[PDB]
């Protein structure tokens, strides 16, 4: 840690802080995630263990690089490549204008390439939300925060607890499925895609039941024909209201015919939901470019 100059705090967390830092010898600008080690009670947190071990297998231009792990006495630092801001703040900054569609297309294309790579390497992210997605001035976007990420060479068991903030949570999870699948990451990305296009969360639920119902109202209440097995799922109730599926042309007005088709396949109820790889081959991306954003720094 002696060769790192702390520049400023750029992030606060549960197990520690993130600083912008500079390598004094090389000049490399970095993000340092500090983890304080309680060396009586717990040792190295499970989040760090998964995050370190999974991320060092994931070298891809759309996944934030872990550069180093400085593991010592009573401190653990993760050294990452430095990016300029998260997608949430960029969305907020773009409220009176929207993100232009070519940049949205670019961002979704890159996020899918990042996700495809994760999935091909049996890693589930499980926490894709705009503030975990980092952008730079050159027009790159990358997946970050792999604290909840999991290897799935053996199927990953669902929690009672802790997860994906409510708004990007997939229906199977809300309906109490036993195992995660890669479909949950695709669902979240669909929600983020729609949010970029419309400038509002697609499904801003106040609670689990409210979250489900907002999905039902937009996409229709799922039945055995749409999603074989729904009615047998743990948290399914026959008392659920039966709403009709509405036009995507009214859910995402600015999207063209191809954009609507991709989003509907990403928000498919039966986790038949499009894969990241299959989504990359969609005609929506047949003219993708790499525009640069107006980052208000």
């Amino acid at each position: 840690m002696e060769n790192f100059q702390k520049v400023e705090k750029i992030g606060e967390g549960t197990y520690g802080v993130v600083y912008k830092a500079r390598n004094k010898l090389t000049g490399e600008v970095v993000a340092l995630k500090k983890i304080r080690l309680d060396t009586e009670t717990e040792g190295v947190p499970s989040t760090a263990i998964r995050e370190i071990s999974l991320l060092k297998e994931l070298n891809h231009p759309n996944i934030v690089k872990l550069l180093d792990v400085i593991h010592t006495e009573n401190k653990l630092y993760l050294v990452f490549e430095f990016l300029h801001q998260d997608l949430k703040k960029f969305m907020d900054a773009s409220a009176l204008t929207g993100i232009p569609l070519p940049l949205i297309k670019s961002y979704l294309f890159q996020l899918l390439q990042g996700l495809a790579f994760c999935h091909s390497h049996r890693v589930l992210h499980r926490d894709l939300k705009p503030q975990n997605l980092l952008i730079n001035t050159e027009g790159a976007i990358k997946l970050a925060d792999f604290g909840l990420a999991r290897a799935f060479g053996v199927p990953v068991r669902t929690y009672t607890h802790e997860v994906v903030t409510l708004w990007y949570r997939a229906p199977e999870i809300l309906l109490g499925c036993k195992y995660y699948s890669t479909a949950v990451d695709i669902w979240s990305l669909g929600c983020i895609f729609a949010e970029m296009v419309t400038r509002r969360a697609l499904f801003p639920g106040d609670s689990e039941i409210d979250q489900l119902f907002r999905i039902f109202r937009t996409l229709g209440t799922p039945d055995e024909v749409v999603w074989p097995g729904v009615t047998s799922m743990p948290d399914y109730k026959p008392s659920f209201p039966k709403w009709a599926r509405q036009d995507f042309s009214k859910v995402v007005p600015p999207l063209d015919e191809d954009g609507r088709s991709l989003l509907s396949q990403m928000l498919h109820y039966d986790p038949k939901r499009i894969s990241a790889k299959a989504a990359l081959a969609h005609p929506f991306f047949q003219d993708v470019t790499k525009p640069v954003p107006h980052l208000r720094l």
Binding site: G43, E57, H121, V154
Partner: protein
């Protein structure tokens, strides 16, 4: 879509996570027998705390890799295993047992500080490379090629695969994918009389010929299981959760 890519990736990573086959010879104070006792004890601890089978497999992989580059005295072998199980639980379990529980199972032979320091040491020695492929993961992948599924076959395959963890000689010299393939065939043959299917031959590229050496050893381990000094796995797999598959009599020959 992605279970081909994942199998392929697991095949790449299992060649890299290999421990040294002959490490126990270069080890002055500890032996295969002592390792056998350790792993058998880890099976008990997994049953005591209701841990996933994957956690067991990972822990053993961590122990073999640690012991491949570190000399350990017999009185510290259990501390290595404890730290390994702790790390494997953190990696794999939804919520792992707290550290005090791991200190508990060792009958206070080690301290909280010792266990936490060994955790740091094993992370350093393994360079945080904890996502190792296991026999369990390959079995899971192969089970998707069952026409149709048979829980008795799956439980017996898992039983044999778990027995392979106990004896470094001869199982350290086989890849997880290969041990998995032999366990699957042997279980499949014992329960339903069928053989290593053509779908898995295409997926894995392994023939029944290529599995033969490992199959040979696994069959012999299966026959001798009731006489083995370590019994925790047989006991575990006579439960109803595993359809009492550890009571199924093995064939006397394999007819290859």
């Amino acid at each position: 879509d992605y279970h081909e890519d994942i199998h392929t990736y697991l095949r790449e990573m299992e060649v890299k996570c290999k421990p040294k086959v002959g490490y126990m010879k270069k080890q002055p104070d500890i032996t295969n027998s002592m390792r056998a006792i350790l792993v058998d004890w880890l099976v008990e601890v997994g049953e005591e705390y209701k841990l996933q089978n994957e956690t067991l497999h990972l822990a053993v992989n961590y122990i073999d890799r640690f012991l491949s580059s570190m000399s350990v005295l017999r009185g510290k072998l259990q501390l290595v295993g404890t730290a390994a199980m702790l790390l494997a639980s953190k990696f794999e379990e939804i919520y792992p047992p707290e550290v005090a529980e791991f200190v508990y199972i060792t009958d206070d032979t080690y301290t909280k500080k010792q266990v936490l320091r060994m955790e740091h040491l094993v992370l350093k020695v393994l360079t945080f490379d904890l996502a190792a492929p296991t026999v369990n993961q390959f079995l899971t992948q192969y089970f998707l090629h069952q026409q149709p599924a048979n829980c008795k076959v799956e439980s017996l395959a898992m039983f044999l695969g778990e027995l392979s963890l106990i004896d470094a000689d001869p199982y350290l010299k086989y890849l997880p994918s290969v041990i998995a393939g032999a366990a699957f065939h042997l279980a499949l043959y014992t329960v339903t009389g069928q053989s290593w299917p053509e779908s898995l031959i295409r997926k894995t590229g392994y023939t029944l010929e290529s599995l033969k050496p490992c199959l040979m050893d696994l069959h012999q381990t299966y026959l001798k299981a009731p006489q083995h000094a370590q019994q925790s796995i047989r006991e575990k797999y006579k439960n109803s959760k595993y359809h009492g598959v550890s009571l199924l009599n093995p064939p006397e020959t394999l007819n290859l």
